[PDB]
Symmetry: C2
Subunit: 73 residues, 2 copies
């Protein structure tokens, strides 16, 4: 009925939480052309290049999976 999340965890949109979820909500804001908060931008600017690259590349493969689901539907 509600799925795994009733709402975003407190502080996420302000840059607090696990780095993968912070980068995912940053991706969500970019997908929807919404400006992120200052805390979120600070978090984005402070993540190590390596771990962020890994996280975003995995996001890329998640999108690829969604596209395959759409094609196969």
């Amino acid at each position: 009925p509600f799925g795994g999340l009733k709402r975003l965890p407190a502080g996420l949109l302000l840059g607090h939480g696990p780095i993968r979820m912070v980068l995912a909500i940053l991706a969500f804001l970019r997908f929807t052309a919404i400006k992120p908060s200052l805390g979120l931008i600070n978090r984005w600017g402070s993540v190590g290049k390596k771990e962020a690259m890994e996280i975003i590349k995995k996001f890329k493969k998640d999108l690829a999976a969604m596209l395959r689901i759409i094609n196969a539907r």
Copy 2:
């Protein structure tokens, strides 16, 4: 400040709202391995293949841009 979004709009996690934002939050839930609600699943299964392909391909361009920014940092 706190960015253009203090919280997700009402109903979005339950599948209500513009299709781009609904697919963006589905992407977020996939990125973070969180199960979507039945309403979101219904939206996902009901969206036109063409329109969803276009939206998700644009998301792929957004992730490419984020990766570009990380590489530039």
